[PDB]
């Protein structure tokens, strides 16, 4: 309730701890299921790959 | 060229534009052409019961059927059937047969709905089996009179048990007549069945009379054509009234297709299993997984596998039933093969077995086996 310290300060930072994991976990969402679809039409022939094309 | 049937019901119109709503003189109008070999004896389906104790003393389907029975163009295989049929309704193995297929004569929403899907989706199974067992008596070698208007019985009794089910399941669940009359009429219509005789039944208890059109009694009479002769009952040292009903149920076990040593006991109990004499003979069990097998996987394998199996080439089914389709898959489409993955230990069991008997066919479409 102080000047510095108001009641919503926690409001932000609650909203800072939430967006670091979405916005990750979004990209890293997009990373694999846009490669795995890739290894998985690259790798039907030729399946010598499967481990090192992950 | 076993039979054939017609369902244009202005042909023989004279009989059926009046009222003539009465089995009183209904012999009487049938005549009526230069029918004298041939008028008496289509009246012979509803002379024993047609009368004597008659609800209404016709029908709409009681008459037409007596009608389309045309038998201008030869009357001995309808003759052998009258013959046949009646002088087979004399012993108790036959009155057995017609008592265990005859009577005497919340989270329970989700119980009851799944009661009655499992009734639509069980008996909707068994209308396609039936409906790929009339064309394998198509193909040349089999029967046409005997088979075709049995087995077109049990697929219209088993649609209709198939819409009970559905009608129930969605009666329950929208709350929790009209409709199931709307699916009888509706497979009325179509084709036409061929007649078979009526099987009048006369004991100690009553004179009694079953339909043949009815599943219950042809459900009942495959029953009774299963098992294989035994010591007695055939041979000519005890010749009291065998040679006219054991005689009778062979020509019929062997019309459908069925060698006189096959045994076919129905499996369907709550009881313990066929003990040892009842049993297969550890070649037939192999082969009915097979055919097990050709029904679970796809709906056109049975009709092929038998055609190939009566031409004795029965170690070539898996790669005659192969057939190619697509997969969209993430590397363009790829035409994979489907095809019958049978092992070798069934693939020689269905050449100890030369022709399927269609008897044994019949027991696999209705869930015996």
């Given at each position: 309730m102080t000047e510095l310290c108001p009641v919503y300060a926690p409001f932000f930072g609650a909203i800072g701890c939430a967006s670091a994991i979405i916005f990750t976990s979004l990209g890293a969402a997009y990373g694999t299921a846009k490669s795995g679809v890739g290894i998985c039409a690259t790798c039907v022939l030729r399946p010598d790959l499967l481990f090192k094309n992950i | 060229?076993?039979?054939?049937?017609?369902?244009?019901?202005?042909?023989?119109?004279?009989?059926?534009?009046?009222?003539?709503?009465?089995?009183?003189?209904?012999?009487?109008?049938?005549?009526?052409?230069?029918?004298?070999?041939?008028?008496?004896?289509?009246?012979?389906?509803?002379?024993?019961?047609?009368?004597?104790?008659?609800?209404?003393?016709?029908?709409?389907?009681?008459?037409?059927?007596?009608?389309?029975?045309?038998?201008?163009?030869?009357?001995?295989?309808?003759?052998?059937?009258?013959?046949?049929?009646?002088?087979?309704?004399?012993?108790?193995?036959?009155?057995?047969?017609?008592?265990?297929?005859?009577?005497?004569?919340?989270?329970?929403?989700?119980?009851?709905?799944?009661?009655?899907?499992?009734?639509?989706?069980?008996?909707?199974?068994?209308?396609?089996?039936?409906?790929?067992?009339?064309?394998?008596?198509?193909?040349?070698?089999?029967?046409?009179?005997?088979?075709?208007?049995?087995?077109?019985?049990?697929?219209?009794?088993?649609?209709?048990?198939?819409?009970?089910?559905?009608?129930?399941?969605?009666?329950?669940?929208?709350?929790?007549?009209?409709?199931?009359?709307?699916?009888?009429?509706?497979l009325k219509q179509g084709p036409m069945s061929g007649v078979l005789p009526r099987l009048e039944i006369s004991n100690v208890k009553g004179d009694f009379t079953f339909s043949m059109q009815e599943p219950a009694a042809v459900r009942a009479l495959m029953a009774y054509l299963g098992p294989k002769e035994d010591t007695s009952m055939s041979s000519p040292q005890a010749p009291k009234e065998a040679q006219e009903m054991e005689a009778a149920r062979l020509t019929l076990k062997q019309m459908l297709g069925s060698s006189p040593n096959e045994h076919l006991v129905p499996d369907v109990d709550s009881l313990l299993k066929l003990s040892d004499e009842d049993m297969p003979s550890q070649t037939e069990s192999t082969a009915n997984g097979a055919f097990k097998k050709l029904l679970s996987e796809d709906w056109d394998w049975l009709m092929p596998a038998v055609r190939a199996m009566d031409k004795g080439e029965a170690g070539k089914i898996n790669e005659k039933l192969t057939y190619k389709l697509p997969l969209d898959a993430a590397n363009g489409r790829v035409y994979l093969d489907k095809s019958p993955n049978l092992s070798d230990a069934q693939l020689d069991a269905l050449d100890k077995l030369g022709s399927p008997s269609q008897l044994r066919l019949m027991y696999l479409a209705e869930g015996w086996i």
């Open positions: - | 060229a076993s039979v054939s049937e017609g369902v244009l019901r202005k042909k023989y119109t004279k009989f059926f534009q009046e009222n003539i709503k009465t089995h009183l003189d209904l012999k009487q109008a049938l005549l009526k052409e230069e029918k004298p070999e041939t008028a008496l004896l289509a009246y012979s389906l509803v002379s024993p019961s047609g009368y004597r104790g008659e609800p209404l003393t016709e029908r709409k389907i009681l008459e037409v059927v007596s009608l389309l029975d045309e038998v201008k163009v030869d009357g001995d295989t309808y003759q052998q059937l009258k013959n046949t049929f009646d002088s087979i309704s004399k012993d108790p193995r036959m009155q057995v047969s017609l008592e265990n297929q005859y009577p005497g004569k919340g989270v329970g929403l989700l119980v009851a709905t799944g009661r009655e899907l499992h009734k639509a989706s069980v008996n909707g199974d068994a209308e396609a089996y039936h409906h790929q067992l009339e064309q394998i008596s198509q193909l040349p070698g089999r029967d046409q009179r005997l088979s075709m208007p049995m087995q077109q019985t049990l697929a219209i009794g088993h649609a209709m048990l198939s819409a009970e089910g559905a009608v129930g399941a969605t009666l329950g669940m929208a709350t929790g007549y009209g409709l199931n009359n709307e699916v009888q009429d509706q």
